[PDB]
Amino acid sequence: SMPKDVGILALEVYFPAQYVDQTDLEKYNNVEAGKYTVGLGQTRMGFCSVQEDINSLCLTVVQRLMERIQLPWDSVGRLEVGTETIIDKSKAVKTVLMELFQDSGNTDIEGIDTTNACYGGTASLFNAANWMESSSWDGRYAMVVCGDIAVYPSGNARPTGGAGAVAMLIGPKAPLALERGLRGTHMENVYDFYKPNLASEYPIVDGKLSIQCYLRALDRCYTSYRKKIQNQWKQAGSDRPFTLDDLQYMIFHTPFCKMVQKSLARLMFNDFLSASSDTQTSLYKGLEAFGGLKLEDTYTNKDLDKALLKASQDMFDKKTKASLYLSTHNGNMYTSSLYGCLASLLSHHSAQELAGSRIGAFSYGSGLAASFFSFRVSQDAAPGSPLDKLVSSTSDLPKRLASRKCVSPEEFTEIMNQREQFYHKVNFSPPGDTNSLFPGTWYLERVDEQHRRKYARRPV
Amino acid sequence: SMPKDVGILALEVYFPAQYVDQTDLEKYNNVEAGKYTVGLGQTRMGFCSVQEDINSLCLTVVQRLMERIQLPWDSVGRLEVGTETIIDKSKAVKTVLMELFQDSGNTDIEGIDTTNACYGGTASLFNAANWMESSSWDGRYAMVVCGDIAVYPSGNARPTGGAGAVAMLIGPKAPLALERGLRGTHMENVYDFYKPNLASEYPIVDGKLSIQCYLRALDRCYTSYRKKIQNQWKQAGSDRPFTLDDLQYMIFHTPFCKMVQKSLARLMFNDFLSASSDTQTSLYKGLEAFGGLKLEDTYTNKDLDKALLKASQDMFDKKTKASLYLSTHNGNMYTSSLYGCLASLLSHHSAQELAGSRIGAFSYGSGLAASFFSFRVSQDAAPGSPLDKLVSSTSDLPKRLASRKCVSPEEFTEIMNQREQFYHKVNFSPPGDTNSLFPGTWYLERVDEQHRRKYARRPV
């Protein structure tokens, strides 16, 4: 008897207590007004000083989740971290997270860390569902943790960084149930974005190539997903094709907001090119002029790009725009970006609005690994229902974002420079007033002579 | 309908074509004769020049496996790498392995990389079984890959390095079936061995602490495993305790061979301390003098250590010794060490001898993460059976090891120094005669100006 409706029961997001404003950053970088706020679609970018690291981000979000829902230590049977922020080549963040469990005597917890660029959180989610449905499940919850500190050198990528983490409690009878058998996955060997300079926080990135690879992976994953759901539909006696009309919401890994608007447009072009001649003429009149073009052309053909943005605007506004709130206010937090979009979706809509819907999700990691998958939302939206509890837990997201402190581009730059200076340092205590951290935040208190990191927690 | 007897169908091992002799290394290091060959129990240590890296090791073992069993590209639905040899902080070895699959059009392959010290291979194995038993299984095989290049600076740890990789094909109806529900797992936050110097290949290691942590994890995992199997036995109407008598073979992560002899002894001490007063007097006469001591004392008490080695000698010879052949001749290859012991076990015994048996397995990774689990071997040992095929595939292991070239400690040291020199280099082709590689070996042909690695393959 495989457990039913395996999925997300609870979700917690963490982001740092300061950001740099994109309009300010434009002026600081001497670029044209609107290049970041309109061109990239970004409003504010969160960032961390050396006082926070991947361990402290994950400790913070996990302990906050457990405290909020009063989760017993003995109730977690799997705990796994997805990240691409590596501060130790052998020792997993999972082992550090055991600080939260081991003293209580609960150390029989499967899972370690798993990495490929921005895809590791999804890998951990899939692993958790796989475990829970297997002969190895022991009735306990799984906890999926992901997070990252996304930083670039001064230059055109710097405004697309960010930072944060997400923890998700996975269990049976979940209000956001993973739709079984529907993982459209695509992996291939590319060099769009990678981190081969082991002593640098910075990736090597080919911006244009990374955008092309994200979109090609989207094409492939969407095709795989459609094939799989159509096969299920056929078995159930329906020959209809899957299109964006079959998704009520659609969320994406979000390196910047404009990327996602273009990505929803790319999905519509896929629907169009896959549609019958009749359907094309009936539903896609504005796209008929482009019936002979290729998916890849949405990136090079300006008339096509514009037509697609126009044609998909309503769907974007209805299915995707709300999910971008955290991203536009915090930036790209890599593995947890997609899950921050899920949080934003939950924060915007009522349980009654979400009830019974399908949420499509696209996860990408450069290099590359990608999956398109979906959740089915419970029909039960009554007060006190699992769905109501989940939705309610996210409602204060905009207030939380608003409580952060704006930092000048000058000071932000100094803090980034400090990250470079301290990257490899030992025997030191990270500078910074702990009063500038949110209550309950774990932080790096000291790196000792032997490069061992010690953490402390701001009360509350 | 969950698939039956999920487990290992095929196993491939790769190790480099040269080793340094431990007796020679003793003389080179000016250490007492026998310190390495007797003290550590090591005979020869495999090593790689800069011409081989974690990607090339994994490409080699995967392609060799697929060619030997003529595995169709479309037959693999999950592929995941466990390793602690990190040469890119974002881009997974899995993505590079897609070079073997993507041109054939099979890119819908779940899995990425997973890391914690020497435990990642096991994590990948568990993830593969979990996937295969879940709603996400699509009928295809999983492939578990692990490998590592284990190197230390000049000093007392250097003789306990090694290198290699293993690929395992996982599927239903396997001749080595994972015993369901029997994973005794223990994770906790320690600093016994870790790699915080991102630009160095070398770990920070506290040797004594690492030995203590391995043994403590062994205690915890064995206790967890015993509890779980005893619970299954109780449900089946049996109250008897599990002991080493219930294992026909017992294989371990092997940092060096002496460690493993002491580990089997530690398990016997656990049986003894857990046994009834009556059982103690009947079966453990030589241990009664120590009935008041603690598990941890096997490391500090010489009388106890000696008594345990003597008392467990017969069990060691029968259950564990044969499994150490590859380890004594190749060294510690980290994540794939345990699985090399499995290969050694298969190479030594006939299918008829193994048929129907239980193989216990202990996997450890510093930091730490550990699991004690087991396999049930098929009863079918007829010629051409899955078990016969698996066993036969390993029979030439000693011949393969014997075909390697012995390199002087002087030249070995130069090659290690060269690894340090070239670690971060770009825009170069690794020196070394490709004729010194085994046929069919992938190797690093060039690292370009953008730190992109290009691989080539020695024919056959």
Ligand SMILES: CC(C)(COP(=O)([O-])OP(=O)([O-])OC[C@H]1O[C@@H](n2cnc3c(N)ncnc32)[C@H](O)[C@@H]1OP(=O)([O-])[O-])[C@@H](O)C(=O)NCCC(=O)NCCSC(=O)C[C@@](C)(O)CC(=O)[O-]
């Ligand atoms: C994204 C790039 C490449 C941009 O770098 P860029 O050099 O600024 O490119 P650009 O000059 O084309 O500018 C971008 C946009 O601003 C517009 N623009 C220009 N001026 C104005 C103005 N005055 N007013 C209004 N708009 C303006 C401009 O025209 C354009 O929009 P478009 O026309 O293409 O629709 C850069 O920031 C970068 O390289 N970022 C890092 C890579 C990345 O984020 N790639 C995304 C896909 S890959 C992925 O998401 C994975 C990732 C990155 O998370 C990593 C991982 O998996 O680990």
Ligand SMILES: CC(C)(COP(=O)([O-])OP(=O)([O-])OC[C@H]1O[C@@H](n2cnc3c(N)ncnc32)[C@H](O)[C@@H]1OP(=O)([O-])[O-])[C@@H](O)C(=O)NCCC(=O)NCCSC(=O)C[C@@](C)(O)CC(=O)[O-]
């Ligand atoms: C293992 C150590 C600490 C040893 O380094 P050492 O302590 O300097 O050597 P030693 O002086 O302790 O001698 C060791 C053994 O040789 C004996 N000996 C001495 N001289 C002679 C002689 N003339 N003739 C015969 N025997 C001799 C000696 O007495 C003893 O055996 P014992 O008495 O304890 O049974 C070192 O090599 C090291 O630190 N290695 C790396 C760490 C390691 O392998 N630890 C194992 C457990 S942790 C684990 O396995 C994880 C790992 C390491 O793979 C990492 C990962 O998870 O990623």
